[PDB]
Symmetry: C2
Subunit: 286 residues, 2 copies
Amino acid sequence: MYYIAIDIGGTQIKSAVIDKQLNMFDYQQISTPDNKSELITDKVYEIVTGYMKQYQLIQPVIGISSAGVVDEQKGEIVYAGPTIPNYKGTNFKRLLKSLSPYVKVKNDVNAALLGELKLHQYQAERIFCMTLGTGIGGAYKNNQGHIDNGELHKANEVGYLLYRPTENTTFEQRAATSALKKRMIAGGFTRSTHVPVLFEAAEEGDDIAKQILNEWAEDVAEGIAQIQVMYDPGLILIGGGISEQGDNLIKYIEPKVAHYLPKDYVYAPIQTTKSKNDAALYGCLQ
Amino acid sequence: MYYIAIDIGGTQIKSAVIDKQLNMFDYQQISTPDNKSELITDKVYEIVTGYMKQYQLIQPVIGISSAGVVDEQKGEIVYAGPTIPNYKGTNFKRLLKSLSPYVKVKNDVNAALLGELKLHQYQAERIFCMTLGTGIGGAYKNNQGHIDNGELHKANEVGYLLYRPTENTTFEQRAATSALKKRMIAGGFTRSTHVPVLFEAAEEGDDIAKQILNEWAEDVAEGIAQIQVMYDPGLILIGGGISEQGDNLIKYIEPKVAHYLPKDYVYAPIQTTKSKNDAALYGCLQ
């Protein structure tokens, strides 16, 4: 059986066909429209009809992963930031009703975690994933196997942790990847915008790069400590583009989590996600 | 059918028999031994054998609620404070093996929440309870019924939230009841060191009492805001001795949660617990 997977992001819409054996075919990736003159829902419908034509599918199972706050049972966007305008109220089940009655919708961090966990073997039972990007997302897979999305579909909006009144910043406004980029630029990293150059510069011993990274990692670690004492997970995953840095990201963050926890507190191992691109495409089918 | 319920505290050991219709009989209240000359394990064995004789029970169902860190499946004290010396390694299942194979063991905040939830009808699927006392305890009951205790049985240690390096305090060191008593002294409330007199004075219009309460409630609300964006619960209960203040406690805390959340964020209703004494005795059977 062939499955259609679509992952709707702020900047990109990824899609692919997956078979019963999890082989991935016809991976496609386009720019997310402005959702004003050209509609996200039109792109989604074009992708589904495209694959249905190409694979001669009738009533395909379709999985949709999307940014924003998602009501999974309704298959509807409950809320979206102004990043994606006019997005609230978008109902993918209604949109594709003429093509298939088998449409599943998930928010993007939940789908990514479901995919990460389907494709990998982990020792821990309870796994929290924090995704660093424009903002910070969170998802938790619990002792009994499930991801709870909250009473109002707002579980684990961890970017909103640790509001500092004097500075008027949230966790994600200090600790997202976008915040690290702003801190680099203000620190004189002006020729390359790219976050990996900061890590390479630090690896070579450049003190200013190390100081920017450690100060930011300190703010990241503060957020992780809050998640630690609530969830007591067996493993904490860090995802998002910056997670391609692997242990070079972890070594800055992991030792500093201790700074916000009681003396000798044993906290969970911290690692980067392993599947970097496809995770939500697999997860949105689960 | 008769169940034996035992609640082991820092100062008291509560006990009772509960029947099929949740009627409570033969409530007993003794002082916790020093666990040096006379052993807690011996008192529990005595309580269980006493009730078995009196009610002519053979292999009774026994529920045990206890302070400290509890491995519910081993039925074992994983860690205990200095309050109760020598407690770690106590295994109530091994201790009572000769009397019954039906022994359940739970930590005291989890038991109290389960009892609170069995005896009442609430308007929410996901319920967090925060217990204010010497320190602050926490417990969370899920969308799917059960309580996740964490990978090392240390879930929901809300007292460790929000460590501030400059002030060297955790959440509970600012926001627990014992902290309010310290803040009464620091704030100039020379009338009394009793918490109910602080509230009385505030109701009478005392500006110093009002200021101590608002500043303290500000700190309480900061912690509730963190729990809110992680769990997105449908209801937050406040328990502990101070929760006797009912609406007069809630009215200081509830509106301040908004201060640590994004503009127009819709957060859970906040109420005080309803069962004041017996909850863990009911809960340890659940």
